[PDB]
Design an enzyme around this catalytic site. Structure first.
Site, PDB file in Angstrom:
ATOM      1  N   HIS A 153      76.937  -3.769 -14.530  1.00  0.00           N
ATOM      2  CA  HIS A 153      75.715  -3.063 -14.214  1.00  0.00           C
ATOM      3  C   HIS A 153      74.665  -3.858 -13.405  1.00  0.00           C
ATOM      4  O   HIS A 153      73.836  -3.238 -12.702  1.00  0.00           O
ATOM      5  CB  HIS A 153      75.079  -2.586 -15.545  1.00  0.00           C
ATOM      6  CG  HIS A 153      74.369  -3.660 -16.254  1.00  0.00           C
ATOM      7  ND1 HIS A 153      74.903  -4.345 -17.290  1.00  0.00           N
ATOM      8  CD2 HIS A 153      73.075  -4.197 -16.039  1.00  0.00           C
ATOM      9  CE1 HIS A 153      73.971  -5.232 -17.776  1.00  0.00           C
ATOM     10  NE2 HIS A 153      72.855  -5.126 -16.975  1.00  0.00           N
ATOM     11  N   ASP A 366      87.448   9.297   0.794  1.00  0.00           N
ATOM     12  CA  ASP A 366      88.744   9.751   1.448  1.00  0.00           C
ATOM     13  C   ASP A 366      89.263   8.558   2.183  1.00  0.00           C
ATOM     14  O   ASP A 366      88.582   8.030   3.108  1.00  0.00           O
ATOM     15  CB  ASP A 366      88.422  10.946   2.412  1.00  0.00           C
ATOM     16  CG  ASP A 366      89.672  11.440   3.163  1.00  0.00           C
ATOM     17  OD1 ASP A 366      90.716  10.735   3.179  1.00  0.00           O
ATOM     18  OD2 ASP A 366      89.575  12.494   3.821  1.00  0.00           O
TER      19      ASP A 366
END
Ligand code: CL
Length: 419
Positions: A153, A366
Site C-alpha cells: 500500500h 488489454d
C-alpha cells in the site's frame, strides 16, 4: 485445482532509472481499509501467442522506466519514517499453470481460493526484503489466463495502481505512457504546526465467513434509484448513493440487527477531486480517506432506502478540503501510525465497509489479446467488506461482491433483490 509455478523473474526497469528517497505522506503510511489484491480473467482468442510471457515481461520492464518507484523497496529514513528507496530492484513476475479451467471459478466471487492467483508475500524478512508489486500470470487448461496483481500500500492506492497496470498493457500494445505519473507526495505534507479541526474516528482505534457476488441489471439499478420518490421525498440521490444505501440496509436486515442497534458504514473516498489545490493529474500515491455515516438499524430498515442514501450523501459531502487537511494534521500528531491498525475488527457486524470501483478503469488492461472478461478483488480479506464493480460487458449492470457470516449471506441475497 493444482497451480504449479513454472517460472519466477524479478523484472527490472528496461534501462537505468534515477535514484531518489521518495517521501511517503501520512496517507501512504496508514493501511487503507479497502486495500486488496486484484485478479483479471481473459478468454483465449485462438492466437498462438496468447499472453506470451516474453511480450508481457518486456512491456513490464519498459513500463517501470516512467513508473520507476514501483521497482523500488521500502526503507527507514534517519528519523525512522518508512520511505521508498528508488533503487530499481524490480517487480516479481510469476508464470504459473493450472490444471483446471477458468470456468472453475464460476461467477468469480472473491473467495479465498482466488488468492491462489496472486503471489504470496513473505512480509517477515524486514521491510526491504520484498518487492512493492507482485504479479502472476496463470495459464489454464482450456487456454484462459488470469493476471493477479498485489501492490504494497505504501506505493500507491488503487487509482495509481491501475494507472500503472493500464500503462503496462498500453506498452504491451506499443503505446507509450499516455499520462505520465507525477511523483511528489509532499503535496500531502501536514500543516506546520498541525491543527486538526475535527475528530477523525476513522483513525481512532476502538476503545464461518462466506463470500459471494451478486449482479444487478441496469434496470434493477434504475428501479432502485427511482425509489428516491418514496414517501414524498423530493431530494434526488445518485445511483451510487442509492445502491450503497441499499447494500447497507440489506446487510442490517440480513444480520437481524435490533431496532436500536447502531451501525457504522465506512466508505472509501478518493481525495483527488476534493483537495485544494487539486493534485496534478497522474499523482502517484495514496489519496483515499474514509467517510463514516452512523445510523440506527431500525431507522435504516423501516424508512425508505433514500434515508440510508441521505446518510451516505451527507457523510461524503463533509469530505471537503478542510476535512481532508484536518485528517492529515490529526495523523501528524499521532505517535505511531503503524498502531492505527484498520483490520478484521473494523468491518464486523454490526458495521460494514463499502468501496466502489465503478469509476475506476478496471477493464482497460488489454495486453494485445483483448480486454478482460472480469476483474475484481482477489479474495476478500475481512468479513463485512463489500465492493461495487462496473460491468465487464458495458451493459450498465453492477455487481456487489461481499463477505458476511455464512448464516447471513442467503438473507442478504434475498433482500438485495427486494427492489
Ligand atoms: Cl480455461
Amino acid at each position: 485445482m493444482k497451480i504449479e509455478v513454472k517460472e519466477s523473474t524479478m523484472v527490472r526497469p528496461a534501462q537505468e532509472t534515477p535514484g531518489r528517497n521518495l517521501w511517503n505522506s501520512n496517507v501512504d503510511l496508514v493501511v487503507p481499509n479497502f486495500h486488496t489484491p486484484s485478479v483479471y480473467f481473459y478468454r483465449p482468442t485462438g492466437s498462438s501467442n496468447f499472453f506470451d510471457a516474453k511480450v508481457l515481461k518486456d512491456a513490464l520492464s519498459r513500463a517501470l522506466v516512467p513508473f520507476y518507484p514501483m521497482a523500488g523497496r521500502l526503507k527507514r529514513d534517519e528519523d525512522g519514517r518508512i520511505e521508498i528507496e528508488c533503487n530499481g530492484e524490480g517487480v516479481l513476475f510469476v508464470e504459473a499453470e493450472s490444471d483446471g479451467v477458468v470456468d472453475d471459478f464460476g461467477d468469480f466471487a472473491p473467495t479465498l481460493e482466488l488468492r491462489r492467483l496472486i503471489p504470496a508475500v513473505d512480509y517477515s524478512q524486514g521491510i526491504s526484503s520484498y518487492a512493492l508489486l507482485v504479479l502472476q500470470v496463470t495459464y489454464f487448461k482450456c487456454g484462459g489466463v488470469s493476471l493477479g496483481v498485489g501492490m504494497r500500500h505504501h506505493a500507491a492506492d488503487g487509482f495509481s495502481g491501475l494507472h500503472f497496470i493500464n500503462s503496462w498493457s498500453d506498452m504491451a500494445r506499443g503505446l507509450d505512457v499516455t499520462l505520465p505519473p507525477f511523483i511528489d507526495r509532499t503535496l500531502l505534507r501536514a500543516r506546520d504546526p498541525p491543527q486538526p479541526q475535527f475528530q477523525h474516528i476513522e483513525y481512532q482505534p476502538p476503545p464461518e465467513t462466506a463470500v459471494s457476488i451478486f449482479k444487478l441489471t441496469r434496470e434493477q439499478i434504475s428501479a432502485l434509484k427511482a425509489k428516491s420518490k418514496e414517501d414524498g421525498n423530493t431530494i434526488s440521490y445518485s445511483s451510487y448513493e442509492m445502491l450503497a444505501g441499499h447494500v447497507w440496509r440489506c446487510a442490517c436486515k440480513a444480520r437481524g440487527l435490533e431496532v436500536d442497534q447502531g451501525t457504522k458504514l465506512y466508505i472509501a473516498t478518493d481525495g483527488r477531486a476534493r483537495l485544494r489545490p487539486s493534485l496534478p493529474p497522474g499523482y502517484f500515491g495514496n489519496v483515499i480517506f474514509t467517510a463514516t455515516p452512523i445510523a440506527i438499524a431500525g431507522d435504516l430498515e423501516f424508512k425508505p432506502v433514500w434515508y440510508a442514501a441521505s446518510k451516505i450523501h451527507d457523510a461524503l459531502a463533509r469530505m471537503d478540503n478542510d476535512y481532508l487537511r484536518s485528517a492529515l494534521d490529526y495523523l501528524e500528531l499521532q505517535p505511531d501510525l503503524k498502531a492505527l491498525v484498520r483490520g478484521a475488527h473494523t468491518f464486523k457486524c454490526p458495521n460494514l465497509g463499502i468501496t466502489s470501483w465503478v469509476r475506476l478503469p478496471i477493464h482497460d488492461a488489454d495486453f494485445g489479446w483483448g480486454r478482460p472478461i472480469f476483474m475484481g478483488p482477489g479474495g476478500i480479506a475481512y468479513e463485512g467488506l463489500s465492493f461495487i464493480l462496473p460491468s465487464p460487458t458495458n451493459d450498465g449492470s453492477m455487481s456487489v461482491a461481499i463477505s458476511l457470516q455464512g448464516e447471513h449471506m442467503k438473507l442478504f441475497q434475498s433482500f438485495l433483490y427486494d427492489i
